[PDB]
Design a protein around this ligand. Sequence first.
Ligand SMILES: O=S1(=O)CCCN1Cc1cccc(F)c1
Ligand SMILES: O=S1(=O)CCCN1Cc1cccc(F)c1
Lengths: 199, 199
Amino acid sequence: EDAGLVAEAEAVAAGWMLDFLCLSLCRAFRDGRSEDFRRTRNSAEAIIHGLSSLTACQLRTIYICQFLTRIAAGKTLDAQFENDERITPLESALMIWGSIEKEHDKLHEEIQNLIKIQAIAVCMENGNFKEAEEVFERIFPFKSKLLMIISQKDTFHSFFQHFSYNHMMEKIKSYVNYVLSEKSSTFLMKAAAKVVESK
Amino acid sequence: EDAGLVAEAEAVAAGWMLDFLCLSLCRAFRDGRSEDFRRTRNSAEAIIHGLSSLTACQLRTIYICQFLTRIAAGKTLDAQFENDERITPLESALMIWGSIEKEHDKLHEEIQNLIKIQAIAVCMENGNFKEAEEVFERIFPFKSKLLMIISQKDTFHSFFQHFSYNHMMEKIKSYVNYVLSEKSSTFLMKAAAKVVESK
Ligand SMILES: O=S1(=O)CCCN1Cc1cccc(F)c1
Ligand SMILES: O=S1(=O)CCCN1Cc1cccc(F)c1
């Protein structure tokens, strides 16, 4: 048995599992299946540990997984993340979004700006207004207006209703649909669908 | 898009990933690649969470993974396991070994008896003789002899040298070779090897 060739076959299969789990993560995020998203996320994270060298395409795939993971935890309150990252899940999603090797088109700016406002608004929704001000300081006349809204706990201001959570999710979901179409034809899902269609 | 058929394709692919990760877990255990075993174990555990209904063959596969996992942690000292299971990894491997749907042949008895003695000997090797006596009580003139050996801290007694750790590992490795031959032809590894052979 050639250990080198076995390790190569295992790397090929890890690459296939990564695409399959990204495809599944995208669908669960689109569908709102939280528990399924959490399980697929755990599987993708474990499979990714089995890879030590990634191609440009594989790096793009893992960063999309990390990005959707932070967006899904935007409203969740976990100190462990605040202990290590020292920022909020949505601020962490913003850092990933701005460094993915992808086109900075109109949809990229829309998603970026919605995450920027929602990183502040989710803290206000949770009643943590000191945190909302800290998030504002780390990200940013516009600044004066936005700071007055936070100071006045004006959570339901028309600005927040235009730059809403639902609007952020809809725009991110539209981007996820493009990822889903690109990967819908990857090896593992395509072979899995052919078995189900044969039955 | 039919959600039911997509979920079925995902179940088919989870089944393939399970066989692939079992195959990889078996090879890492056989080869002594500890870090690779730990990563494959984490991947198999995550993939298994994505399955809610398992066939008789799939249950056999997950129990082989659990069995090898306990054997690998036989000498490791972790209270969390002792907190939940309240037993030692090797006693836990013994419970799994005796309930896998498999033939109770000569090799099954050999492995069982080697695990039984090694669950005691690994505690003596770690200097925990009170624990070795507690393990002995939970598992078991033979008992009087074995208890005298533990009481006298006679770790290197000829009985322990015949029922050694190395002998336990060699017998378990021979069983793992049979598992490896049965699964060496599963879909994911077979398709992965064909890609590497083509290059
Ligand atoms: O980025 S992380 O903080 C590293 C620990 C898991 N986090 C999210 C994640 C989800 C899915 C795949 C992945 F590589 C990473
Ligand atoms: O049996 S456990 O205590 C459940 C938590 C993980 N443990 C070992 C394991 C390894 C690999 C696959 C599996 F299903 C289980």
